[PDB]
């Protein structure tokens, strides 16, 4: 990985050593970035709803996985299921049980730093993973991108500044998540986020991720070209908010 500080260094080291398994997957690959483009055409706001009980940023919610996920299946373009145990209280079991209950695309949210993690996601029933430009070396990032695609996934490439953007573009990203929160500090910067989103090339599906609590931020962002919105904390706290986000 790259030089990492603080809780990122910790979780990355955790992820390098986490156990992988031998398996066979069930449900076929249901493309998320493709489903985002269908929703765009159907003029349904595309929301990637995350299920995560905890988060470094302070989220703290106890909610049933299956009931949450069945409810969201009715509205969301896809689900982001946290599988990182220490900082998100997720697990491989949580992804597995959810991927079996629902028939929409599922993004495994974790710190993907080795190839056996992508085998895990595939075997667990995930349809894609996120790969983080700040965490991976450029040649790790290119390789894992290609490794995910070899399975039939299109990874979401997570960026934060124009430099993450040059790297993600250079190594052939087509599906990009612009984070509003710095992964290290967890400081939000929507002004820097909006700048990046305006910049993204026409040929790339883009996602505005983190810090959305209102339907009217979704609107102003839509005028920028935003294809989908990664929302978790607000939905974990009040899942009826999804009705707000999509109207």
Curated annotation (Swiss-Prot):
Domain of life of the source: Archaea
Name of a matching Pfam family: IGPS
Q: Which SUPFAM superfamilies match?
A: Ribulose-phoshate binding barrel
* InterPro entries hit by this protein: Aldolase_TIM, Indole-3-glycerol_P_synth, Indole-3-glycerol_P_synth_dom, Indole-3-GlycerolPSynthase_CS, RibuloseP-bd_barrel
Q: In which pathway does it act?
A: Amino-acid biosynthesis; L-tryptophan biosynthesis; L-tryptophan from chorismate: step 4/5
State the UniProt keywords alphabetically.
Answer: Amino-acid biosynthesis, Aromatic amino acid biosynthesis, Decarboxylase, Lyase, Tryptophan biosynthesis
Extract the Gene3D superfamilies matched here.
Aldolase class I
Q: Which GO terms describe its molecular function?
A: indole-3-glycerol-phosphate synthase activity; phosphoribosylanthranilate isomerase activity
Q: Which GO terms describe its biological process?
A: L-tryptophan biosynthetic process
Q: What is its EC number?
A: 4.1.1.48
Q: What reactions does this protein catalyze?
A: 1-(2-carboxyphenylamino)-1-deoxy-D-ribulose 5-phosphate + H(+) = (1S,2R)-1-C-(indol-3-yl)glycerol 3-phosphate + CO2 + H2O
User: What PROSITE patterns is this protein classified in?
Assistant: IGPS
What interactions and quaternary structure are annotated?
Monomer.
Q: Which family does it belong to?
A: Belongs to the TrpC family.
- Tell me the protein's name: Indole-3-glycerol phosphate synthase
Q: Species name for this entry?
A: Saccharolobus solfataricus (strain ATCC 35092 / DSM 1617 / JCM 11322 / P2)
